[PDB]
Structure formats: structure tokens, C-alpha cells
Design a protein around this ligand. Structure first.
Ligand SMILES: CCCCCCCCCCCCO[C@@H]1O[C@H](CO)[C@@H](O[C@H]2O[C@H](CO)[C@@H](O)[C@H](O)[C@H]2O)[C@H](O)[C@H]1O
Ligand SMILES: CCCCCCCCCCCCO[C@@H]1O[C@H](CO)[C@@H](O[C@H]2O[C@H](CO)[C@@H](O)[C@H](O)[C@H]2O)[C@H](O)[C@H]1O
Ligand SMILES: CCCCCCCCCCCCO[C@@H]1O[C@H](CO)[C@@H](O[C@H]2O[C@H](CO)[C@@H](O)[C@H](O)[C@H]2O)[C@H](O)[C@H]1O
Ligand SMILES: CCCCCCCCCCCCO[C@@H]1O[C@H](CO)[C@@H](O[C@H]2O[C@H](CO)[C@@H](O)[C@H](O)[C@H]2O)[C@H](O)[C@H]1O
Ligand SMILES: CCCCCCCCCCCCO[C@@H]1O[C@H](CO)[C@@H](O[C@H]2O[C@H](CO)[C@@H](O)[C@H](O)[C@H]2O)[C@H](O)[C@H]1O
Ligand SMILES: CCCCCCCCCCCCO[C@@H]1O[C@H](CO)[C@@H](O[C@H]2O[C@H](CO)[C@@H](O)[C@H](O)[C@H]2O)[C@H](O)[C@H]1O
Lengths: 99, 49, 50, 99, 98
């Protein structure tokens, strides 16, 4: 459901299906990737860790929206996609680390 | 994946523009008005700190 | 600063890193213990006599 | 041999008797073949490293498709000399595929 | 709330570095962050509807969570878009008075 909603929100606002691919992929990678560190740290799949995982989808979705909206804004301002990507990550990549 | 701003439409975009394009322009009109409203609102807020 | 520069310009490195993360999460899923709750009941020992 | 002996025992033993494997046979009977997961994981990880090295989803196949021939050369030597594919031979195959 | 507000503040800071005044930078930062903040808020909020409107297995934890997230997200959005730039300007003017 989160993946369907974010896809539709991205299409509604940015009006290109290409922008919806970024969360489409990034969200499941980020959620499924979480299990390898949970495994290494000795955790179990239980109703509480699984609940945290679903709440975390919110943070993961916001991350993907931040990146793709900021690239697309720079494209709306006339930059080619490659320059728009570099400019967009000069704007948010350091902040993402800090966040 | 993202195309330059006014690129020719590919097949899925044209399909979405067909299927759903009637949503985009009223939403676009509503976002622009809401955006301008927020701008005035926060601007008056900053004068009332 | 553009901490993403290298990946933006060489997207297959980004793909490979994400697939590796994904793959290792998939491997880990069936290795995880599974229960309703974490272990929170204090351990106890019963002595029975008759 | 184990399947045959299981079959034999169904044919031979009276109701109320059965066989149980013990020692190394019990381990053989209760172990899964994780090779079915290990081998595809190994190939896929090696493919991914090479995809990054060559910046190509297809050039890794020029390497990967070659390794079955080294394994066949070695196993042909075993066949010709009357050997078997014991665990020492098997590690040798993998090192030769590595080289 | 923190994720959204850190970027409002970062953008305003950048806009001052690139010449703009304290107030102009705060306002332009909010203008730039408005769309992604609202996209996330809409996505989150819509996702709470099946938690609010779903009875059966797990319904009790689903319910308390949706109410918490729905209400919290309205506040995330509104206080992030209106309180943050006020604090930004106040603290900037506090350390650049004369
Ligand atoms: C360039 C060098 C190449 C890099 C090589 C990468 C090596 C990666 C190897 C990871 C192997 C870890 O191996 C694994 O470790 C974990 C965590 O410590 C152990 O522990 C795991 O299982 C045990 C139960 O058995 C539990 O405590 C728990 O669920 C989990 O932590 C496992 O028993 C062991 O199988
Ligand atoms: C829990 C332990 C954590 C302790 C350490 C936390 C450190 C967090 C560091 C992440 C910062 C990296 O992110 C980077 O931040 C600096 C400011 O610092 C920004 O820099 C920006 O402001 C600085 C001035 O402050 C200007 O000189 C510059 O023109 C501008 O780019 C970069 O654009 C951003 O890419
Ligand atoms: C579940 C997670 C899945 C994630 C899936 C992500 C798939 C995304 C594919 C990313 C595309 C990158 O994949 C690959 O990138 C490289 C650049 O690095 C491109 O490569 C191109 O540029 C490079 C230079 O960088 C040249 O050397 C090369 O000859 C040229 O083809 C490939 O043509 C493209 O196929
Ligand atoms: C599209 C991919 C979805 C995104 C991934 C998100 C993953 C979230 C957690 C997935 C965890 C899978 O967790 C797993 O659950 C299944 C099914 O209930 C159990 O699996 C069990 O299912 C059935 C019967 O119940 C048996 O046929 C099976 O052999 C047995 O293992 C596993 O023992 C448990 O480890
Ligand atoms: C990438 C960011 C990572 C940030 C993570 C920071 C982690 C902070 C440290 C937390 C400490 C981890 O501590 C770890 O807790 C788990 C709790 O399930 C314990 O887990 C233990 O009990 C659980 C039941 O709940 C059983 O599966 C098992 O018998 C055992 O592993 C581990 O024995 C302990 O090693
Ligand atoms: C668009 C992005 C949205 C971001 C926010 C989305 C957050 C999702 C809300 C949380 C969903 C809760 O999901 C819910 O979790 C609880 C706890 O694991 C499960 O609850 C389960 O475990 C508990 C024990 O803790 C049992 O008493 C219960 O009977 C059982 O159903 C529910 O079966 C599941 O429906």
C-alpha cells in the first residue's frame, strides 16, 4: 500500500511516471535490507520489530520523495536531468547524512 | 530516468495523460492557488512573531 | 557538496550496492528467529516433589 | 543406498518395527541441501562485482560462461584416471574455476 | 518533523549564503520545501485510512497507530510550515542584531 500511495502522490504532483520509479525501488530495497543488520545484531522477527519496520516505511518514503522531488524541481527550472541530479544532491546530500 | 522538462511524451505518459489528464489541470490550479495562499499566510505570520 | 557525484555518474555502481543490500536482507529473512514478542518473561526454574 | 534401505524396510519389517538412521547417515537424512541457495548466491555476487567493474550488465558473462569448461577439464582428468569427486577434488575444482 | 525542518533551515541558510536577507531566505526556503512536505504528508495520511477503517485481526494496534499518525502528521505539516521559519528568523535576528 505504501508503494502504491507514494507512486500515485508522485504522479499527481510531479506528473511523470518516471519519477515514481525512484520510490518504487528505493522503498523495498530499504525495508528488505533492514533484515540483514537485524540478523547480525541478534534480533528476531516479532510483532514489535515488525511494527517498527512498518512505521519506518514513513521515513523511507519521505527520503525517496525528498530526492526525486528535488531533482525534478531542478528539471522544472530548465536543467538537464544529469545536471539537475548533481545540483539537487549538492542541495540535500550532506543534509541527508546529517538527518 | 527523468526526461528534460518539455520532452516528447512517451507511450505510458500519453496513456496516463489520456486516462487521467483531466485530474492534472484542476489539481495544478488548486496547488498554485494553495501555494500562493500559503506564501501570503507565512509572510504575515513572520510579521507577527 | 555532492556526496552522490560518483553514483550519479556511474549508476551501475549504485544499482550493484542496492542489489547487494537487498540480497543480503533476503538471505537473512529465513535465518531470523520468529516469535510474538521478544524474550521478556523472567527465567524461572520449577522444583516438583510429591 | 539410504532410499533403497528405506524401501526394503517397508517391504520387510512387520507392523510395529521400523528403521532409524544413526551416526553419519542420520546427518545425511536430516540435513537440507543449502547448496541450492549457496551456489546461485555465489554466482550472483560474482556477477554483480563484475558488472560494477565493467560498468556492463552483459560483459560479466564473458567470464562467467568460461568457468564450466575448466571444471570439465579437471573432471575429465578424474574420469580418465578412475578417480571420484571427493571433497578434496571438489575444492580443487572451485580453486581452478577461481584461477 | 525533524527531517522536514532541518531542510527548511538548511535551504534558508544556503539562500543567505547566496545573498538573500534573513526574512527573504526563510520565505523562499518555505516556498521550496512546501511541495515535498505536502507530498509526504498526503502519502502518510492516506496510508492511515486502512488502519483507522480496518477491523479484524490486529485491529486494535492498527487503530491506535493510525489515530496517532494521522493527528501527528497534521501537526508535522502545519507546525513545520509555519513555526520553523518564525524560529529561523527570530534566532537569526538574535545573533545579527546590530
Ligand atoms: C572482503 C572480505 C569478505 C567479507 C566476508 C563477509 C563475511 C560475512 C560472514 C557473516 C557470517 C556471520 O555468521 C553468523 O553470525 C551470526 C551473528 O554473529 C551468528 O548469530 C546469529 O545466529 C545465532 C544463533 O545461531 C543468534 O545469536 C542470532 O539469531 C544471530 O546473531 C550466527 O550463528 C553465524 O552463522
Ligand atoms: C553522532 C555524531 C555526529 C557528529 C558529526 C555530525 C556531522 C554532520 C555532517 C554532515 C554535513 C555534511 O553536509 C555539508 O554541510 C555543510 C555545512 O556543514 C554544507 O556547507 C554549506 O555551508 C557552509 C558553511 O557552513 C559553506 O561553507 C558552503 O558554501 C555550503 O555548502 C554542505 O553543503 C553540506 O554538504
Ligand atoms: C532490487 C534493486 C534493483 C535496483 C535496480 C536498479 C537498476 C538500475 C540500472 C542502472 C543503470 C546503470 O547500469 C549501467 O550503468 C552504466 C554506467 O554505470 C551504463 O554504462 C554506460 O556508461 C559507462 C560509463 O559510466 C560506460 O563505460 C558504458 O560503456 C556505458 O554503457 C550502462 O549502460 C547501464 O546499463
Ligand atoms: C515482495 C516482498 C515483500 C517485502 C518483504 C517484507 C518481508 C517481511 C517479512 C517476511 C518474513 C517471512 O517470514 C516467514 O513467514 C513465513 C510465512 O508465514 C514462514 O514460512 C512458512 O510458511 C508456510 C506455512 O506457514 C510453509 O509452507 C513454509 O515452508 C514455512 O516456512 C517463515 O518461516 C517465516 O520466516
Ligand atoms: C545501522 C544502525 C544500527 C543502529 C543499531 C544500534 C544497536 C544498539 C544496540 C542494541 C543492542 C543489541 O543487543 C541485542 O539485543 C537483542 C534483543 O533482541 C538480544 O537478543 C537476545 O534475545 C532475543 C529475544 O528478544 C533472542 O532472539 C536471542 O536469544 C538473543 O539474541 C541480543 O542478545 C543482544 O545482543
Ligand atoms: C504511507 C506511509 C505510512 C507510514 C505509516 C504506516 C504505519 C503502519 C501502521 C502500523 C501497522 C500495524 O500492523 C499491525 O501490527 C501489529 C503489531 O505488529 C499486528 O498485531 C499482531 O500482533 C499483536 C501482538 O503485538 C497481537 O495482539 C495481534 O492480535 C496481531 O494481529 C497486526 O496484525 C498488524 O496489522
Amino acid at each position: 500500500e505504501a508503494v502504491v500511495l507514494v507512486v500515485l502522490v508522485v504522479i499527481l504532483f510531479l506528473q511523470t511516471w518516471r519519477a515514481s520509479i525512484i520510490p518504487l525501488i528505493a522503498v523495498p530495497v530499504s525495508v528488505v535490507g533492514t533484515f540483514s543488520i537485524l540478523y547480525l545484531l541478534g534480533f528476531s522477527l516479532n510483532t514489535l520489530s515488525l511494527f517498527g519496520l512498518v512505521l519506518a516505511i514513513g521515513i523511507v518514503v519521505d527520503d525517496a520523495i525528498v530526492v526525486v522531488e528535488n531533482v525534478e524541481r531542478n528539471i522544472e527550472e530548465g536543467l538537464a536531468p544529469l545536471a539537475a541530479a548533481h545540483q539537487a544532491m549538492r542541495e540535500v546530500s550532506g543534509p541527508i547524512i546529517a538527518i | 530516468l527523468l526526461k528534460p522538462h518539455g520532452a516528447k511524451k512517451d507511450l505510458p505518459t500519453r496513456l496516463i495523460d489520456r486516462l487521467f489528464g483531466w485530474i492534472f489541470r484542476p489539481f495544478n490550479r488548486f496547488f498554485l492557488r494553495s501555494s500562493n495562499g500559503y506564501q501570503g499566510l507565512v509572510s504575515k505570520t513572520l510579521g507577527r512573531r | 557538496m555532492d556526496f552522490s557525484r560518483f553514483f550519479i555518474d556511474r549508476p551501475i555502481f549504485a544499482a550493484v550496492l542496492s542489489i547487494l543490500i537487498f540480497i543480503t536482507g533476503l538471505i537473512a529473512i529465513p535465518l531470523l528467529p520468529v516469535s510474538e514478542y521478544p524474550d521478556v518473561v523472567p527465567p524461572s526454574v520449577q522444583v516438583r516433589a510429591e | 543406498a539410504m532410499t533403497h534401505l528405506e524401501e526394503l524396510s517397508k517391504q520387510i519389517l512387520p507392523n510395529g518395527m521400523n528403521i532409524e538412521w544413526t551416526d553419519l547417515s542420520f546427518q545425511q537424512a536430516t540435513q537440507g541441501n543449502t547448496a541450492l541457495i549457496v551456489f546461485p548466491v555465489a554466482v550472483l555476487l560474482a556477477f554483480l562485482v563484475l558488472a560494477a567493474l565493467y560498468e556492463s550488465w552483459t560483459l560479466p558473462l564473458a567470464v562467467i560462461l568460461i568457468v564450466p569448461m575448466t571444471m570439465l577439464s579437471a573432471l575429465f582428468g578424474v574420469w580418465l584416471t578412475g578417480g571420484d569427486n571427493n571433497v578434496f577434488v571438489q575444492v580443487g575444482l572451485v580453486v581452478l574455476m577461481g584461477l | 518533523a525533524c527531517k522536514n525542518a532541518i531542510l527548511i533551515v538548511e535551504f534558508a541558510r544556503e539562500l543567505e549564503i547566496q545573498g538573500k536577507g534573513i526574512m527573504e531566505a526563510a520565505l523562499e526556503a518555505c516556498r521550496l520545501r512546501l511541495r515535498p512536505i505536502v507530498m509526504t504528508s498526503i502519502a502518510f495520511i492516506a496510508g492511515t485510512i486502512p488502519l483507522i477503517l480496518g477491523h479484524g485481526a490486529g485491529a486494535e494496534v492498527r487503530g491506535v497507530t493510525g489515530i496517532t499518525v494521522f493527528s501527528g502528521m497534521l501537526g508535522v505539516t502545519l507546525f513545520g510550515l509555519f513555526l520553523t521559519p518564525v524560529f529561523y528568523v527570530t534566532l537569526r535576528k538574535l545573533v545579527t542584531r546590530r
